[PDB]
Design a protein around this ligand. Structure first.
Ligand SMILES: CN(CCOc1ccc(C[C@@H]2SC(=O)NC2=O)cc1)c1ccccn1
Length: 271
């Protein structure tokens, strides 16, 4: 019934607020000009990239990769580092979805493993506009053209995300909508190697109802927003497979690669 669907929507939105530091609301403000405390440092070329990394050096030190390697790869490892952090926030959020923790532990792993990237790219869109993407928790803004200049391999790993983002952001979803959308993505019963599909689908069915109600109430005038949003799920899935193909190419043609352990777990045998 409706009351429970709304309570489910709010539960998810609250845990979403607690699990993810940089929400779309905060992100759009920064990208717009609101919040009077700092303007994002913009990296649009190699000089600015240097100045950006220097400023980070004026500050304390953090276990990362303080250059001596190629730009395209530092940037590449930078995204992966941020992804490791994302996996932890997303996993915490996943555990807040009613029913999730009670699913077979193996399926939780599988759902997480296949849904984490689709969620990372969904959340990333919130930090992107047609010209760039926020980095360092809003501290910075790296341009789309700069990312597209990196040597060919790495020069085009973000372009598909930007293209998806522009389309996705045109739906103008807010955080309360995204929180439910993300839950629907995690609770996908079509993931490879699932042992108990039934339990997963019943949870997703409730999530879908809650999402539909949310979009109708929060966006009364947006015609077929629900259906359009569900279709974006095909694009997200494609972005992930593309990315995995690009990772294979790199592993096959780069001297060496090196992927963070947590990411190694996620990528080990994935679509
Ligand atoms: C926050 N930014 C913005 C771009 O942000 C991302 C792009 C792709 C991912 C997915 C990663 S990259 C990989 O191979 N596997 C993954 O899970 C995650 C974030 C940066 C950009 C440069 C340096 C540090 N930070």
């Amino acid at each position: 019934e409706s009351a429970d669907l709304r309570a489910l929507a709010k539960h998810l939105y609250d845990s979403y607020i607690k699990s993810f530091p940089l929400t779309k609301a905060k992100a759009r403000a920064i990208l717009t000009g609101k919040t009077t405390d700092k303007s994002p440092f913009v990296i649009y070329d190699m000089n600015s990239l240097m100045m950006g990394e220097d400023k980070i050096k004026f500050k304390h030190i953090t276990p990362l990769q303080e250059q001596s390697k190629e730009v395209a790869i530092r940037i590449f490892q930078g995204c992966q580092f941020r992804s490791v952090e994302a996996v932890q926030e997303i996993t915490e959020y996943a555990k807040s979805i009613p029913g999730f923790v009670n699913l077979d532990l193996n399926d939780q792993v599988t759902l997480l493993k296949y849904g984490v990237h689709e969620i990372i790219y969904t959340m990333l869109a919130s930090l992107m506009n047609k010209d760039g993407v926020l980095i360092s928790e809003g501290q910075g803004f790296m341009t789309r053209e700069f990312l597209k200049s990196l040597r060919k391999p790495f020069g085009d790993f973000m372009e598909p995300k930007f293209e998806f983002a522009v389309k996705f952001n045109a739906l103008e979803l807010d955080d309360s909508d995204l929180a439910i959308f993300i839950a629907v993505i995690i609770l996908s019963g079509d993931r490879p190697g699932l042992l108990n599909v039934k339990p997963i689908e019943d949870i997703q069915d409730n999530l879908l109802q809650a999402l539909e109600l949310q979009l109708k109430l929060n966006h009364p005038e947006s015609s077929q927003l629900f259906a359009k949003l569900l279709q974006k799920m095909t694009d997200l899935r494609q972005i992930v497979t593309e990315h995995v193909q690009l990772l294979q190419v790199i592993k096959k043609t780069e001297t060496d690669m090196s992927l963070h352990p947590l990411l190694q777990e996620i990528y080990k045998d994935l679509y």
